[PDB]
Amino acid sequence: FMVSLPRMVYPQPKVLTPCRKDVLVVTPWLAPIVWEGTFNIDILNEQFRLQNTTIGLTVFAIKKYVAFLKLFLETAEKHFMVGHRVHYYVFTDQPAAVPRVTLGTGRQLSVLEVRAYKRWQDVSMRRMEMISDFCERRFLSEVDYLVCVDVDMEFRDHVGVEILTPLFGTLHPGFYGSSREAFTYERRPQSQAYIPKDEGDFYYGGAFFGGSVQEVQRLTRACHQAMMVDQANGIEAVWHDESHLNKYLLRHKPTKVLSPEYLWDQQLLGWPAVLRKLRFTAVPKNHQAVRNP
Amino acid sequence: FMVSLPRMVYPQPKVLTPCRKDVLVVTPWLAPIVWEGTFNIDILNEQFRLQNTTIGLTVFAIKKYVAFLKLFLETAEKHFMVGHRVHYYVFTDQPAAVPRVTLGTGRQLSVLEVRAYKRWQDVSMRRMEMISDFCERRFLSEVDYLVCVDVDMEFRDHVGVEILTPLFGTLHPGFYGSSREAFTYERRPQSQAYIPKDEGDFYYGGAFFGGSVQEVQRLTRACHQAMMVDQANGIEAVWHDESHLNKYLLRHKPTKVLSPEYLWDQQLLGWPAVLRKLRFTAVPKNHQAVRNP
Numbered sequence: 001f002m003v004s005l006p007r008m009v010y011p012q013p014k015v016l017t018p019c020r021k022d023v024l025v026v027t028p029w030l031a032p033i034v035w036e037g038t039f040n041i042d043i044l045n046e047q048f049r050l051q052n053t054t055i056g057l058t059v060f061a062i063k064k065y066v067a068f069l070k071l072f073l074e075t076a077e078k079h080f081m082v083g084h085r086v087h088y089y090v091f092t093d094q095p096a097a098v099p100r101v102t103l104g105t106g107r108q109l110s111v112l113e114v115r116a117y118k119r120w121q122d123v124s125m126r127r128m129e130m131i132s133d134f135c136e137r138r139f140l141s142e143v144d145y146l147v148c149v150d151v152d153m154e155f156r157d158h159v160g161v162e163i164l165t166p167l168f169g170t171l172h173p174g175f176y177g178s179s180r181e182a183f184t185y186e187r188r189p190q191s192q193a194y195i196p197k198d199e200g201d202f203y204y205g206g207a208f209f210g211g212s213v214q215e216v217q218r219l220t221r222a223c224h225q226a227m228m229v230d231q232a233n234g235i236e237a238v239w240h241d242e243s244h245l246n247k248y249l250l251r252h253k254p255t256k257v258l259s260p261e262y263l264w265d266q267q268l269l270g271w272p273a274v275l276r277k278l279r280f281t282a283v284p285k286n287h288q289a290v291r292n293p
Numbered sequence: 294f295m296v297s298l299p300r301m302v303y304p305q306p307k308v309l310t311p312c313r314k315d316v317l318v319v320t321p322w323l324a325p326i327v328w329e330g331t332f333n334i335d336i337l338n339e340q341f342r343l344q345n346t347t348i349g350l351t352v353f354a355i356k357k358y359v360a361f362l363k364l365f366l367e368t369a370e371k372h373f374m375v376g377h378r379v380h381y382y383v384f385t386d387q388p389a390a391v392p393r394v395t396l397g398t399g400r401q402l403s404v405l406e407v408r409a410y411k412r413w414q415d416v417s418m419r420r421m422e423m424i425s426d427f428c429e430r431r432f433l434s435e436v437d438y439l440v441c442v443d444v445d446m447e448f449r450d451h452v453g454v455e456i457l458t459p460l461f462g463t464l465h466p467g468f469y470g471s472s473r474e475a476f477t478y479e480r481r482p483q484s485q486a487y488i489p490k491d492e493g494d495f496y497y498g499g500a501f502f503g504g505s506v507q508e509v510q511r512l513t514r515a516c517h518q519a520m521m522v523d524q525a526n527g528i529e530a531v532w533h534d535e536s537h538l539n540k541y542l543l544r545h546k547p548t549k550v551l552s553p554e555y556l557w558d559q560q561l562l563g564w565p566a567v568l569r570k571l572r573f574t575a576v577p578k579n580h581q582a583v584r585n586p
């Protein structure tokens with residue numbers, strides 16, 4: 001914990017030059033918004049390697065979504081926390097369908113067998129319960145941070161220790177330039193996910209969040225308990241786990257926010273100038289086909 | 294610790310508008326640089342009041358510097374952490390010379406009697422030993438954060454919970470626009486404070502640093518132990534405690550950096566456009582007169 005950095009030679013920070021002139025790089029509660037140009041990865045790598053950091057990555061591959069694992073894991077090997085200790089946790093109803101992907105040194109993979117729900121909405125929402133539960137089973141004793149992502153994705157560029165913090169969310173790529181009234185929060189007061197039209201900082205994506213194990217256990221437990229209240233009341237939030245994630249992060253502000261570099265869809269949104277890197281991207285899929293037998 | 298924010302109405306953060314176009318607002322290790330325009334103090338106040346935060350302020354008033362206490366404490370009452378629990382710790386060789394300043398509710402003051410050294414350099418440097426020591430005597434059991442400042446100063450504007458973080462330093466007002474080779478770090482390899490010409494992020498001021506009690510105890514202990522090594526080797530760093538502070542913060546990066554709004558000298562430097570507020574400022578003094586009998 002008490003550990004000195006070695007001597008390093010790198011460019012001097014420039015106090016009187018903004019690191020970005022086109023985007024917000026800090027939230028109003030002083031959380032960094034992580035864009036390329038904001039960080040020197042050499043300094044961050046040193047800080048996190050000196051603390052012997054282990055990062056857990058959770059991914060759900062239930063029913064037909066096992067098809068996405070090979071690309072997901074291959075590309076994670078090229079781009080996700082390279083040089084750091086990584087533990088992948090693949091949650092699936094089909095252990096035998098997990099592809100045999102070759103891992104770099106210091107990286108391991110565990111297959112966690114879980115039930116499949118019929119409705120895609122329930123598969124998506126029940127990730128919160130399943131993550132919270134495994135926080136006691138394994139994660140508290142095995143990793144320092146958890147990164148919780150969608151599987152229908154691939155890494156195309158660096159995703160590293162710059163994201164690590166007690167609690168982070170990611171700007172949804174559909175909404176980063178939108179006004180809060182256009183955000184697709186849950187708007188029915190009868191749901192635990194309700195956010196009024198005059199509230200909201202950002203629209204966070206359900207496909208990429210994380211933090212310390214303690215903060216992720218808190219978040220996932222809270223979202224699951226809220227879902228259960230909604231279920232008892234006969235209501236399902238408009239965007240499922242993402243709606244609840246958004247309510248949680250409004251009331252418990254994240255300590256870093258990831259830019260849409262970290263959660264993108266090039267088919268739908270192209271490659272705008274404001275994105276210097278496209279790091280973690282959607283794999284094209286046919287919702288109706290892939291979500292049903 | 295687990296505490297939800299209430300509903301709040303405030304302006305939506307603007308993802309595609311920088312909060313400052315003229316200054317760096319985040320370090321390359323993703324620490325916020327605190328300037329006006331970077332923070333919504335209403336959100337921060339909520340976060341810190343929900344955690345029932347107590348802030349300790351240490352100040353040394355040794356020998357003739359007791360004269361600075363009345364203005365220092367009066368202006369702290371107007372501007373420093375108003376609304377939060379505050380404990381002032383006045384270190385002095387003359388308990389009876391501490392002025393009777395009226396305090397707001399939830400704010401208290403303790404007088405800590407310490408020895409006076411002859412040389413101003415030693416008075417300044419021995420603050421590290423004295424702070425580290427009182428971390429066990431009182432601070433661990435009494436406060437959450439410590440703010441450690443010069444007494445030859447006055448508050449002129451808000452200094453609040455925006456500064457609070459595990460470890461912070463402040464940009465020295467003489468050097469915030471300077472290249473690292475112009476920084477007045479200790480440049481003799483025989484001193485524990487030595488920093489080579491090609492290293493250094495910022496020139497931090499010895500007059501304003503702080504953090505959690507744990508991190509402040511670490512810092513002050515390390516700087517005192519380094520001073521003692523230098524003393525045994527017959528060398529005194531060029532800028533005394535400030536030199537050692539700079540070496541420490543180079544190797545243990547702060548989690549926030551305060552802009553020179555928080556440490557200014559209007560007589561020497563005026564009021565540049567880049568400073569929207571002048572918060573904590575030098576009181577004009579005659580070094581030779583005030584540092585000697």
Ligand SMILES: O=c1ccn([C@@H]2O[C@H](COP(=O)(O)OP(=O)(O)O)[C@@H](O)[C@H]2O)c(=O)[nH]1
Pocket residue numbers: 059060061062063064065120123124149150151152207290291
């Ligand atoms: O049949 C399913 C449906 C969903 N998921 C998981 O739930 C996540 C969220 O669903 P999806 O990616 O379909 O949501 P979208 O990105 O299309 O909104 C997926 O990435 C998978 O990890 C799954 O494993 N199987």
Ligand SMILES: O=c1ccn([C@@H]2O[C@H](COP(=O)(O)OP(=O)(O)O)[C@@H](O)[C@H]2O)c(=O)[nH]1
Pocket residue numbers: 352353354355356357358413416417442443444445500583584
């Ligand atoms: O005789 C002295 C000399 C120094 N100090 C303390 O040490 C700090 C640092 O010294 P000073 O302010 O003279 O340094 P400068 O700001 O002029 O570099 C002061 O603010 C006081 O808190 C003191 O109390 N008495």
Ligand SMILES: [Mn+2]
Pocket residue numbers: 150151152207
């Ligand atoms: Mn998806």
Ligand SMILES: [Mn+2]
Pocket residue numbers: 443444445500
């Ligand atoms: Mn001073």
